[PDB]
Structures are given as structure tokens and as C-alpha cells.
Amino acid sequence: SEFMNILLVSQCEKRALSETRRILDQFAERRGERTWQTPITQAGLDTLRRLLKKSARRNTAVACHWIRGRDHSELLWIVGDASRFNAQGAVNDWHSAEDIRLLTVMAALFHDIGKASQAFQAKLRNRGKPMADAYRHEWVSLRLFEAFVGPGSSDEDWLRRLADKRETGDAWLSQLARDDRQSAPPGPFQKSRLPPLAQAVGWLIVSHHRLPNGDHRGSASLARLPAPIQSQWCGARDADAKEKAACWQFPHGLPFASAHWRARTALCAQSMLERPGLLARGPALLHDSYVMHVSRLILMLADHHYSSLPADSRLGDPNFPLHANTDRDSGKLKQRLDEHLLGVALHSRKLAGTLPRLERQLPRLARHKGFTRRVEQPRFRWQDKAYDCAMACREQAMEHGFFGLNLASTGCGKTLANGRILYALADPQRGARFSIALGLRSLTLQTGQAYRERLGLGDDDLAILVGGSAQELLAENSHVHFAGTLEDGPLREWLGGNSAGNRLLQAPILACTIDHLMPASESLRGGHQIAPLLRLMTSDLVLDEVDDFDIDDLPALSRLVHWAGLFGSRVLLSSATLPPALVQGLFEAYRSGREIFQRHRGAPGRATEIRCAWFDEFSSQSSAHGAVTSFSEAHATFVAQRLAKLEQLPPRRQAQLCTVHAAGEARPALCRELAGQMNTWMADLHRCHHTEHQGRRISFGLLRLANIEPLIELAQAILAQGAPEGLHVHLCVYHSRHPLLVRSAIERQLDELLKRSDDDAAALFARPTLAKALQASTERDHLFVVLASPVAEVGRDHDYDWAIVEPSSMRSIIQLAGRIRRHRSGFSGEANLYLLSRNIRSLEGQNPAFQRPGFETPDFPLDSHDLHDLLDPALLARIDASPRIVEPFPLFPRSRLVDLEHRRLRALMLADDPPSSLLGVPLWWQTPASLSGALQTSQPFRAGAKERCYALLPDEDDEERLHFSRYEEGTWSNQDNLLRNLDLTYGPRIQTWGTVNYREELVAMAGREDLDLRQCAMRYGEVRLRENTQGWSYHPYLGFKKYN
């Protein structure tokens, strides 16, 4: 296209300036000490920006200006430090840091002290066959540490003794309480045992690999943590073997006999002693979720990184008998015990001191024209209101936290809105960092790329975390697609320089799933919390389509929201269907988090008054709240006004109930008759809602089924029968049980073809796929049809002419309604949405009928599974968000579909007696529960049969042969005995569309990325499947179905 006159000014310094000049001098011409000006292509500019981002350091500061004439100039972008510039061109409060540092370093010095046992030393050089220890090494550490402190001792007592480096000779390990004894001694955390500071150190020691987790789960005991923690909580469920002595031997003795380790421990003990008030802050620290989990973060990451480093002769006594680890590559025992303890301690301090610099040193997104550009189009006018509203409360949100609700109607432009809101809350001088976490199990590349497109960002600014969710840190097959600044990362040393974790944190904007961040609070073992915790601590958070979650996943979401609040993040929920009892519980989770956040960080004592905000297509408003009661009242008020505006919007949908007639009801027979009726309904909907051009008529329809098994059967039946007379049916099967790259490619085609607008018939028919399909057939009537799982409700900007929907829940119904005439104005008034009066489960005689997905439970039953009773007939005529955003009063949880959702939500979110678990979700912030894994265990996230991850792999030897394979543990096994191909039958006048030839797309994916054909399948061709003994049937058009 046209050449633009481009100006570049550099405020770079140090080696960054050297690197800037070395790049800009190549592609532009220097016209000052720090200025370039040259005519350039948009392509050449995008290319120049990328290169600049790639080698940018923290000292890089380049501004880019488009000179549009003598009088006018425009700021296009900034790379690096956006301070250094004004509104265009050239011109800490970490109150606990020291306490944290000292705790972490002390814990680090004692963490693997237990590795000094006969058993662990033996295990080190064992060779084979392996088998586990008996007691976990961190548990013996704790009790060694307890033996030194001595029981009933003061904090000054043990510290003054540890600070004295003249001491001593192991007399204190007589007092060692041993758990190999028949009859147990009182656990190290009881009141007459370790003092408070020691308990914090103790907790840190014992919890460095996994959270303690016990069999008693009473709320009272949770309130008393860590007191209850005993040997059975700490991996010593591994019982027995009868040594049981080898774990308690120590010959040679302990790190106390290493002079270097003994010296560094005295300095840390001395430091703790001279720190004003620290000993007295002891008990407050131990019950502070911020202090403990940040310390655990620092410990675990230092431990992770030092473990990977080679032996260091300059560290510890050279003679030292005990080792800590062996080689991973080789098998030889290398890296002494005192060395490792000192190495971890060193890196804990270093990492601790790095944390407060993360705000100033991590890449940010600044002066993005896309978020500042005003909107000329009405229909997205509300985006500008939302932006101004967020700008108007930026200052308060910075000091008080932020809890926002984007309740815009389905189809309004929420993504860009979401981006612009968070952007508004960022420091205008330094710019933004936020993450968009979608409420899907898996994020495809295409859905990630849709975010890029809608936010006007490229892969130098927005990182996509691709895939689903299960010392390598953050999964293994999880790949972060990102091309921006990685080079001069503040945490590059402990994370890899090019690792997923580093990429994840370096990216200004992150796109992922809520599952990808969940481990932040949820993870029970390993360092799976480290990467997403870091993300939470350094970026704001969009929770996108959050209430798509199964109700049983909501307590974990609360834990995560509480943690956003606890670590200084600001939270925006985005969903048209957010119900009162949900936002109420999440607000409280955020509020109680921010309150603790405020004891460390910011001006002390300042009140908890959260900056809350509501946004929708009509208006946006903010106000401050420090109680859930006043928040609830402001929310109820904003909703009430929204209801009035909705209640008076012109209808675009009209629902009608379709009665289904069955037979068997054996699944194949049921799907056959159901397909049979669908042939009539599709014909009816096509006749009413279609587009005509040059004598032909095209319509687009959506068939939504709840579950993939019945969906696949129905697909077979629909293909078997033809189209009805005179009609050509094109079928596209879309669900989550495809290879991930196939699903991405289906979405790519559907997203493109299902873009609509007013008076567009000519462009529509001109689009190649449809142009082709019409030139190929005689028929004048074409139905393009997507048969989809609930995976079509979220993240698809689709405009269908009509839809036939199997009912699962009200959110589902609402979400699908918004996919009908999503882009187009007006409406004939004839029915365009059909709801089966019953769902598959009910037609098969299963009760509860509204579950997997849905809310119906034997404890919360419905008295009729027929939609004729379960909905207000008044609803059919105007499907919008209304029934989800307000609770009805009184509630009929037995008679109404939506009232059940509300009842279930209010019974769970903040109640003291949530169904099943019977432990209140708030115990997460009302108790030190987080010192344990009790709530993550008793209210488990993604409860159910586990999905194991499989792929169609090109053979290691031969690229042209495929094997169905299962991912094990860093390798893929051949599992061809578990895959049966399946041949299909077609009827008259039917074909498929939006399909994908696996091999053709695999080869294409392995072009765009420069990968081996095999490595591309391992990375991008995963499909998640519940283990089934006899395996699956596969067809490229249909994905995988359980094989009996």
C-alpha cells in the first residue's frame, strides 16, 4: 500500500541504545543523535516494530510517529519504557519485603536438612530398582528443625542459640520426636511445641513440595491450622516398609557440622533478632495468606532453579559427606547437601529482592491507539462510555482495588470493551498488563487469534496460552505462542529464558483459559502455582464468560478470585448472564483478598473500599464499596434499570417449543427419529429465514446438543437420511472432541463464513465456499448447518438465521439466542429459535435430566422435565439476559429451570452449609485453610473421571504412517489397538462443510511453525478423552466417539 512518512525518536540508554541504533540505522535513516525519519510501508513498519520488540531491553525507549502533513502528527506505538516520553514525544511500598526475605532464607537453609538420612543418602546412589523412601524428606526436616528449636521454647531462645556460631555438638537431637515409634509424639505445630516464627519457618519447610493434607476436615480444625498438621498429612501416607529408622539415622550427622552452612544460618538468625518487632509479628505472619504463600513462591522457585544448576565447589565444605541430588542426564551423585541449602538460600534472597522491581521491569502495553481511538459506529458507542467510566475511576482503583462487571448483552462487543476497561485503569505513563482468561476447558489458537484481531494486537504484544490442562513447571505440552521481549527478563534467571513460564510472564497481554490460572490457588503439589501466581501478581485479570463453569467448579473460582484480590490484581468479570448470588460471592472473595493485600503494600490502615463498576450496552457507572451489603444494593439497582432497557428492546428472536416423538428409546433409534423431525423443522426455519440472491436462497442454522456421544449419533443419522425434497443440506460437525488443530481450523472457517451484516446478500453469495457450493448443484435452496456441542455458546462471533436447541440450562439458551441475527437489524417476527420440549437424557428416561451439563441433582430435583412447565411462556417471545440477572421472588426451584440455577447458587456461594461439601467457600479467607489442601480436596475443581490426552501421531520412523497415541510422562505410547476407523453413509442432496483433512492441516501447521511433522502433532493435535477400555471410533468429519 502507500508509503508513510515515519519519525522515530529514541530515549534508549546503556546497551539498549546500542541495540536500537543497530536496528533502526538499517531500516530508517538517522537525522539526529536520537532521531530517524524515513518513508516506510505498513508491512515494513510492523516488521520493524517486531524486531525492535524482540531484542528490546528494559532500557529501550522508542516512540513511533506518523507524520501526516506539515501540521499533523500521530503516535503509532511505543516500544519499551513509555515514561521518558510525555503525552506524545520527548520531554517502594513493599512493607513486608524484609520479613518475607528472612523467613524464606531461614526456611531455605533448613528445607532439605532431612535429606541427611540413611534412606535418602542410600536412595541417592541406589541405582535400581527404585521405590520410594517411606517418610517424605521434608517431614524429617521439620522434625529435625523442631528438635533444634526444642519444645516449649521461645523464639528468642532458638534464634539466640542459632546466631551463636560457637554451637555446639548435636545434644539437642536426643529430644528428637520420632514418628517411627509405636505410639506417636505430639505434632510439631501444637501449642506447647514450636513458637510462632518457628512455625512459619516450619510450615515453609514442610510444604515446599506439597500442601499438607489430612483426613480430618472439620471447619473448627481448619480454623486452627497449622496446629493439626501431623505426619499423615505430609506424604507419609506411604506406609509402610519398616525403615522407619533409615529415615531417622543420620551417619554422618547434619549440615550443622558444615561451617559454611552453620555460618550463614547464624547471620540469618542474627538478622531476625535485630529486626525491630519481627519476633512479635510472628503469629500475625503465620496467619497471613500473603506472607506465607509469597514466601512459598520464593522458596519453591529458588529451589527449582538451584536444583537444575551444577555442583559449585566454592560453596560449602568440600569434604561434606551428604549429597542433595544426582545428575538428570547422567546418573552420578553431584551437588553436596550443604551446598544446595546455601545455594537455595542465596537465590531466595536474590529472588525476594527482585519481586518489587517486577512492576517497573516487565514489558507493558502503552499508548495503544486501538484502546484510545473513539468509536464512530453506534452499537459500539457503549464501549466509549465504558472507557470513560474506567478512566474516571482509575485513581481510586489504583489505591483501593477494582471489581468490575461487564454485563453487556450477547453480541455487543465485549472483548474490545474488556480490553479498553483494564487499559483505562493502567498507569498512563507506564501502560497496561492484563490477562484474558476464557471460561472454556481448552483455548484454540484461532480463539486466541480472534482476541488479537479484536484488540488490534499482534504476537509481539499478545501471548496465547494454547490447549487444555492436566520439576518442569507449568505442564509439559502447554505452548505459549509469543514473539515479543523475552531477552532481558527480570526473572529469566530462575525461569528459563525461552521457557513457557518466562514467555507467559513477559507478555504484556496474555490470552489463556481460567484453567491455566487456576493452579495459582488450586495446585496441591509441585510448582504448578508459580507461573500463574507470578502472572496474577503482575497483571490485571479479565474473567471471560466466567459463569459457563459447572456449579461444582465455582468454589475453586472463588479461591482464585480471592487470590487476585490478595496479590494486587484488579478483576473484571465479563458475561451477560451473571446472576446476583454469583457476583455477590465473588465480590466478597475479592474484597477479603484486597483487605489482606492492603496490610502489605500501600498506605497503612487505609480502608477497604473496592472500586466497583458496571458496564453494559446502555451505560457504565462506578462506586466504592467496603461491605457486601452495599455492593449487593448497588448491583440490584444497576440491574433493575438494565431490565427496563432490555424489556423494551426490539425482539430479534422468537422461541417455539418442539415436541419430540421417540421409539426405543435405544440411542441409535432415538437419533434416527429425531433427525427425521429435524428435517421438517429445518425446512420450516429455512423457508422463514433465509437470504435470496439471483433466484437462489441460502440460510444458516445451528443445532445445539448437550453431549458429544448423542451429537455424533445424530450426525450419523442426519448424514444417513438426505436433505428433504428440493433442499441441499451442508453439515458441519463442531465439538471439543476433535484434534485441537482441527477444531482450530473448523472455527477459522465458521468464524469467517458466519460474519453477517445488513443488505449483504451480494457479498455473501460472492464468498468462494458458497459461490462454489451453488455453482456445483442444481438446487435453489441451500441450508448450511452447524451441529455443535455447548462449545458453540462461548467465543464464537456467529450470526445464524435460525437454531434448533436441546435445552440444558438458561444461560445456554440465552447464549444461543444471541447467536441468532447477531449482526443484523430488524426481524420478520416469525419463530427463528426452536427448543426441544425435552432433552436427550429425559427422552432416554434419565433422572436427573438436566445435568452433565446443568444444575439438576437428586437433592435439587425438578418435578417436570418438560419445557412446557419449566419456562414462563412469557419468556419465549423475548429471550434476553433478564431471567439470569435477577432472582425471582419467591423462588420455585422445583418448577422452573432458571429458579433452580439461582437456588443452587445461593445455597453454595457464601452459605455456611453448601450442599455435599458442607464447608463454606469463605473458609478460604476466614481461616488459615490455605495452609492446607483441605478445601481444594473437599471442593475439587474439575471433579470427575480424568481425561488423558491423545493424538494421531506421524510415526517416529515414517512420516506417512499415523498412529493413535497416548501421552504418558514426557513420551507418547502407540495405542493403535484403541482406535477403530468408521465408515459413513450419506443420503440424497447432503454434504459436509467447514471440514478439515487432518494431514493437510497438520502439514500446513508445520509450515507456519517451522516444526517437524511429528513435533507439530504432539504440540497441536491433542484431544482430551475420558479413558475407556475398548477405545474409540474415529472419523475425520466427526471426531472421536466412545467405542463399546
Partner: protein
């Protein structure tokens, strides 16, 4: 009273199940060896873990019915064991008492033999000894 739930956990404990059976098959509880005690402990703990998982994760077709009754009985026992409703994990007809029943049934359906109250007694006595410090605070 179906045993579908019990079977899925046993089918996931074959090594510990066979070990218990062979070690006890003809044994007499009044004269047990170190290794017999430990064979019983190892199986019961394996079952413990699987069944606890089953309740907490709701691994049950709530639509089944005879299965759902079986599930609710386990839930009841769990909530009477772990402190949520009560704190008596070794009480009659509770959690461990039901674990022992699964162990005697598994021996029966594998090798024909029928253990009775005397075996059950010694199992319960082992489970209190080996597992009381899992629930209590000293």
C-alpha cells in the same frame, strides 16, 4: 444393595487385594504376623483412598439409583468420619467398618472362603491402631 462402587475401587487395587488374600487365606486372627497386619493395612488404605476420592469427586451416575443409594451410604460414613457431621471414623457401620466389609467380600468372591466377625474384629482393631493418628490431634 449393589457393589458397583466397591468393585471399581477393588479393580484398582489388585496388587494390594491379592496380597491381602494370599497372606490371610488360612491365618487365624489371634496369631497374626507383622506381614499379615501390614497386608491388611495396605489394602484398607488403598481402598480408603479410592473411596474417599469417589465421594469427594462425586464419581457416581446420580441417575442410576441403586448406585446412588450405595454412594449416599459412603457419603454418610465419610461425613461421620472426617468431622463434617461427626468424628467417629471407627464407629459401627461407619467408614472403616464398611472398608472391612469390602475386604471380606473381596476374599469371598475371589477364593470362595468366608471370613466372619472374628476377622472383622481384628481388622477393625488394626485400623484403629494404624489409622487413629490420621484423624486425631495429640
Amino acid at each position: 444393595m449393589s457393589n458397583t462402587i466397591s468393585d471399581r475401587i477393588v479393580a484398582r487395587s489388585v496388587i494390594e487385594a491379592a496380597r491381602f488374600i494370599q497372606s490371610w487365606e488360612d491365618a487365624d486372627p489371634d496369631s497374626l504376623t507383622e506381614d499379615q497386619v501390614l497386608a491388611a493395612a495396605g489394602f484398607a488404605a488403598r481402598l480408603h483412598e479410592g473411596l474417599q476420592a469417589t465421594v469427594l469427586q462425586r464419581l457416581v451416575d446420580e441417575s442410576n439409583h441403586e448406585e446412588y443409594r450405595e454412594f449416599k451410604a459412603w457419603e454418610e460414613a465419610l461425613l461421620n468420619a472426617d468431622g463434617r457431621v461427626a468424628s467417629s471414623p471407627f464407629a459401627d457401620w461407619g467408614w472403616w467398618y464398611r472398608i472391612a466389609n469390602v475386604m471380606l467380600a473381596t476374599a469371598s468372591q475371589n477364593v470362595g472362603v468366608t471370613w466372619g466377625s472374628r476377622v472383622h474384629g481384628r481388622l477393625m482393631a488394626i485400623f484403629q491402631d494404624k489409622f487413629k493418628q490420621r484423624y486425631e490431634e495429640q
